[PDB]
Amino acid sequence: XAXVXAXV
Amino acid sequence: XAXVXAXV
DNA sequence: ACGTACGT
DNA sequence: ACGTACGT
Numbered sequence A, B: 001x002a003x004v005x006a007x008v
Numbered sequence C, D: 001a002c003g004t005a006c007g008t
Ligand SMILES: *C(=O)c1cnc2ccccc2n1
Pocket: A001, A002, A008, C001, C002, D007, D008
């Protein structure tokens, strides 16, 4: 859920 | 992610 | 419900 | 001259 590299 | 000239 | 982010 | 960055 976090987006820091993928954002899902 | 390393910062030695951009640091991202 | 998954990998992105740069230039001296 | 070099890899760090999280939860909905
Ligand atoms: C977001 O909160 C989150 C948490 N765990 C995960 C596991 C795998 C893919 C995506 C995820 N996203």
